[PDB]
Each structure stands twice: as structure tokens, then as C-alpha cells.
Amino acid sequence: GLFGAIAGFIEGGWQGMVDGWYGYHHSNDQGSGYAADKESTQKAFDGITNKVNSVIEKMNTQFEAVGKEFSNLERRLENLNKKMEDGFLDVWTYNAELLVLMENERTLDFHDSNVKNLYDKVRMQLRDNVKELGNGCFEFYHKCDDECMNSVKNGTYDYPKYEEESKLNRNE
């Protein structure tokens, strides 16, 4: 996709992450598991809810066919009426189908962007205290406990804190 994360460098999804659209899987001495990122999930949910309302609401100003009858001596008028009602019908079908297609494209790319941005947020926080594996994971140059994993997931990782511990690991 446009942002290269979904079915990209992060090759697949997680059946095991049931509580959100985007999030984490951690692995340490204490164990492993999944956790949704609530902030980014909610922000995307809000946008998507806005999108669907927008697409619907903009096509509430839509043409309606009204039943009229014409004599056998009013065939041109009858044809004009039919061409008009059909014409608007075609225009509105076009508007609906196109809008759904274009916006579906954008919805998939929005989710891709949200995953990439979350990844980048964590990356830019961990810096060189981790190795970027290239698969969506960061491998720590230090032991990172549950409280340590919890700090990353809510953006309170103390890099100035683990700075010296990791450089020794990274170099030795």
C-alpha cells in the first residue's frame, strides 16, 4: 500500500490482537503478548466514522422519480421525462459508486499511514537503544521488563535512562 507498512514491511496481521486496529506485541524474560494502541485506534475510528457520515450525507441531495402518465400523442414529452429520470438515476448511481470506490482506496491507505506513523513514533523514541529488524520489531540492547514495555506503549520510555546500559551492550 501507499505507506508500505500493511502487507509491506510488516508482512501480516495479528489474529491475537482482538481489541484494536493497531498495536503491540512484546517479548521479554517475563513473557509475551498482544496489546492494542488505544490512542491511534480511537483517532482512526473517529475519522472513519466521520468518513461514512460524509459519504452518506452528501448523497442525501439526490433525485427522486415521480410517477406521471402521458397520452399516445405525447410521446416526445414521455421520452423527455424518461430520459430525464433515467439521466439523473445514472448520475447518482455514478456519484455513489465512484465515491465508495475512491473513499475505499483512501480508507485502506489511511490505515496503512496510521500503522507507519505509530511505528515511526516508537522508532524515534527508542533511537539506538534498539536494533530495527526490518519486520516491524525492535530488539532491545538491554533487558526491558513489563514496566519498561509499558513505558514504550504510552510514550514514556526513558532513553536518557537506558542510554549507557545499551551502548555497552551494543559495542561489547
Binding site: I6, W14, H25, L101, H111, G136, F140, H142, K153
Partner: protein
Amino acid sequence: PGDQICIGYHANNSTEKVDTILERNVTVTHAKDILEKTHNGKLCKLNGIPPLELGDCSIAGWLLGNPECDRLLSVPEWSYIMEKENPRDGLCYPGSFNDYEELKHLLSSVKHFEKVKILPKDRWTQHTTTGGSRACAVSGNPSFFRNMVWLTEKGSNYPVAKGSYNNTSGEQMLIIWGVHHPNDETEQRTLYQNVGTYVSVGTSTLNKRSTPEIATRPKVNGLGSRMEFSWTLLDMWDTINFESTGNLIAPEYGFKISKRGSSGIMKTEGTLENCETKCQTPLGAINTTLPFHNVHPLTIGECPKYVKSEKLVLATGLRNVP
């Protein structure tokens, strides 16, 4: 070999598919179908108000009072009118109905009439009013449109026939009248005694006249003669004047417009069932909260917007990746 946090995304067992401009048939974790494609196959009450079911009668058959339409002699307020494509019971006495499609269009915005006896038949004291035809027979005897009066010779004379009605009813009133076009001169003489006759009708805004046309025509319902009907809407407090030396088919009644609003004539061969809807189509009633439907373009009531689409599915979740 060290610790890891990974960033990832949800997947599930959804098989929901969507299309994009760049790709088709994409599986997504969540999607929202916004197109109603179902209906209950029935004609229903619309907000508890039943339609007017004409059955085998046409609009003309109803309003003129074709004797086959006697169940319709007094009808309550309706939400839409059901008419067949080719109703059997219309002009029993063959002929034509001027500006008929205009009259049907009027009915799209009328939800009730009060039929008012504007020109009681018994006041035509100088003319015979019992005139009928085998083409409109009832129980084997000649009869006639219930709402109309066929004036004929009385005592071998047909004096100038004049009737007038001031619309004091409190609403606009639909009034129909006709002119009889005989097959031959003997028919004209037996019925009216007079020749070179006319039918004149006048309101403040309408001035419409007619001379009957005698001519041999193909038989319809057994007759080469015809009756040609016309109509007007008589404004509140306006008067309609009828004047004729022969060939007038007078109204006995007018139809006061007693309720107005959005209605319509639905073309259908079907019958009313004991069901309730907010949205009726000729194919059946719709019950949905979805914004679009593809059921039929000709709907009555509080409906979704119609499109020709076979599908409208919005992706809401992300690409569902194994």
C-alpha cells in the same frame, strides 16, 4: 538474542470484500454495506393509512361511477392509489377523457375527496334523467355512470338545459361533464329531438364548448357512439354554468378536495395485504435504516435514495492480511 516490541495490526476471519479504483475484491477486517436490496413483496398500509385499491376500475371508472365500481362510491382518506395497468372497468359507455393524464397528476397531491351532490338529478324537471345504456348494464338492464346524468327528451321536447353551482364547499372542487357523440341521426332525434345542438360550460376562467359529432364508428362495448368527458377544478366561491340544447352528460356530483399531500398512483396488479410500512414500492415494502436501496425507482413515503447499483460496500477496517 534480546527483547522485542513489535508494531502490528489487527487481522480476523472476515471475508468481507470491497473494491477500490486501484484494486478489486479486497478482503477487509470490517466493512459497512450501505445498500438495501430487500423488500417484503407486499403492498401495505403507509403509516397506518391504507391505499385506495381501485381493483378492476380505472381512475375514470371510479370518478364517473361506472356501475362495476360501486364499492368506490364513498372512500376514506388514502396514502396512495393502486391502479392496474389495463383496468377493465373504465368508460363502460365508450369514448374519451380530455386531459386525463393531467387529472391523474392532480391526484398525486390529493389524499381525500368529499363527494358533494352539486346538481341533484331531481331538479332537471324539464328533461328525462333515467337514460342509460346496455353498455353500462346492471342486472340485465340498461344503466349508467352513477355520478353523471344523461339528459334526454321529455314529452317529445328538449328545452335549453341550464344548471349552475356556486362552490361554497370550502375547497377547490373537481367537476366532470361530457358530450354525447351519436352514431346516427335517428339516435340524435330519438334522444334529443333537436339538431345542431351544443354543450356550453363556463366558470370565471373556463369557457369550453362543444357540438356533438354524429358519425358511424367501429363498435366498442357494442356502440359506434361515444361520450367525450372533460373536467375542471372549480375554485372556492366560483360558479360553474352548464347550458345545452342536447347531448349534455351532466355531473350530479363534484369532488371537493378534502385532504392534500404527497401521494401517488402506483401501477400494480396486486392487492393490499395486512401489513404496515413507512416506504412502499410497486414490488413491495421497504423496512431499513440504510441510506440507499436498489429495489425500484418509484417509491412512496419516507424512503432511502434509489440507485441502480448491485452493491455499495464501504471499507471501514483495514486490509485483512493472513
